[PDB]
Design a protein around this ligand. Sequence first.
Ligand SMILES: C[C@H](CCC(=O)NCCC[N+](C)(C)CCCS(=O)(=O)[O-])[C@H]1CC[C@H]2[C@@H]3[C@H](O)C[C@@H]4C[C@H](O)CC[C@]4(C)[C@H]3C[C@H](O)[C@]12C
Ligand SMILES: C[C@H](CCC(=O)NCCC[N+](C)(C)CCCS(=O)(=O)[O-])[C@H]1CC[C@H]2[C@@H]3[C@H](O)C[C@@H]4C[C@H](O)CC[C@]4(C)[C@H]3C[C@H](O)[C@]12C
Ligand SMILES: Nc1ncnc2c1ncn2[C@@H]1O[C@H](CSCC[C@H](N)C(=O)O)[C@@H](O)[C@H]1O
Ligand SMILES: */O=C(\[O])[C@]1([C])[N][C](C([O])=O)[C]S1
Ligand code: SF4
Ligand SMILES: [Cl-]
Length: 346
Amino acid sequence: TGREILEKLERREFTREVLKEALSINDRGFNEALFKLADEIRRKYVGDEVHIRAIIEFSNVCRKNCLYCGLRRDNKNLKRYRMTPEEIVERARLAVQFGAKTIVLQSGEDPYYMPDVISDIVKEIKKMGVAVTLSLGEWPREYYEKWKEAGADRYLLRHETANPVLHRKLRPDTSFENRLNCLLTLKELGYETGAGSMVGLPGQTIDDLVDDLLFLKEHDFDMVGIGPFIPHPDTPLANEKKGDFTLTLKMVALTRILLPDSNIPATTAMGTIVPGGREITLRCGANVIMPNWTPSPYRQLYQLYPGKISVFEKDTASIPSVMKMIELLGRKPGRDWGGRKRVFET
Ligand SMILES: C[C@H](CCC(=O)NCCC[N+](C)(C)CCCS(=O)(=O)[O-])[C@H]1CC[C@H]2[C@@H]3[C@H](O)C[C@@H]4C[C@H](O)CC[C@]4(C)[C@H]3C[C@H](O)[C@]12C
Ligand SMILES: C[C@H](CCC(=O)NCCC[N+](C)(C)CCCS(=O)(=O)[O-])[C@H]1CC[C@H]2[C@@H]3[C@H](O)C[C@@H]4C[C@H](O)CC[C@]4(C)[C@H]3C[C@H](O)[C@]12C
Ligand SMILES: Nc1ncnc2c1ncn2[C@@H]1O[C@H](CSCC[C@H](N)C(=O)O)[C@@H](O)[C@H]1O
Ligand SMILES: */O=C(\[O])[C@]1([C])[N][C](C([O])=O)[C]S1
Ligand code: SF4
Ligand SMILES: [Cl-]
């Protein structure tokens, strides 16, 4: 029964079977109660502040060939771009002028910048008195060390899928073992570390989703980014089914229940698959939003999946828009960098 699974979630009995059953029950009443539980846990542990992370997608060049991703190297039907270091720093400064307290630098795995150009950019942005998060993919330990010395605070490296077999199939350049080793290295070097997964990948099962939740709980990540798989027409997965929004939302809710003090974004992919999806997600366990700060004419070229929102508006619209969102949700913008504030418990 749903009521018993809720009770067990409330008492923190996070067994495999309780998670499977939560993910398998499709009853509306159960789902709504699960979302209310996550919302309430969010409020109690991380409060009403919604932390704004301004993301600059500074290059869409990638050396990898992930099957799901529109930036994969085999996609010849994409105009590739690279922002200059000066452009990146000045665009970051503009976001800080607009009130961002974290700058996220994201790219394809583009060798050009690595490691020294990144280091230089990080140092310049850190002078602005904000947190810096990197989301650059898999690189040697030495690169991660250089970036940490340069002042980077956080690193986002979604684990994608905790099924090693599925991982290697979808990400043929690498492996789950490699991805995990990167995540462990980042944690050792003192980054606030983010992981997370896609929901509704071709071949992914409900037991796989359970294993994603258990993986996340085991390593106690600071941030967890979850969104649905959205097929891209210039990829091998073009004809596969999109991930289900509701199931994805349940994954966010369960993540908050499992990791009550973590930082959990309402991802752009959630807002792409359903109009108003980020706002829903912020009411079902999430506490972070990542407005797109990539400038025109590049923004529209950073196409991991189609239909991405925030492309038609002026390139400074997103920060004001999320501030309006936060207000209409009855929430508050973050006052500090929004680092993880651990609540030690039993
Ligand atoms: C806004 C709609 C529809 C509400 C509605 O329209 N219900 C009828 C009117 C009720 N009023 C009290 C306004 C008047 C009553 C007198 S009347 O004469 O109208 O009958 C309600 C119906 C179900 C609600 C969600 C679920 O909970 C799950 C979840 C819990 C989290 O925590 C917050 C997020 C989320 C997604 C909820 C958001 C929102 O809250 C929803 C969509
Ligand atoms: C960038 C330009 C020119 C002046 C400038 O370069 N300003 C640097 C401000 C730096 N900070 C954000 C760190 C100040 C924090 C002050 S605070 O008292 O909010 O802590 C300034 C002038 C007016 C400012 C907007 C309005 O105000 C309304 C609104 C308030 C929100 O809040 C943040 C978003 C928004 C849209 C503002 C963004 C930005 O800022 C604007 C465009
Ligand atoms: N088709 C698609 N649908 C939904 N999310 C996708 C997607 N393609 C990629 N993503 C997400 O986009 C993220 C950013 S890729 C850029 C960061 C870095 N190269 C890296 O891979 O870590 C990936 O973590 C993945 O979860
Ligand atoms: O999960 C995240 O941190 C990011 C930044 N959100 C992006 C999206 O498109 O939803 C991809 S990773
Ligand atoms: S998911 Fe990241 S590493 Fe993989 S192809 Fe896309 S940009 Fe490159
Ligand atoms: Cl961050």
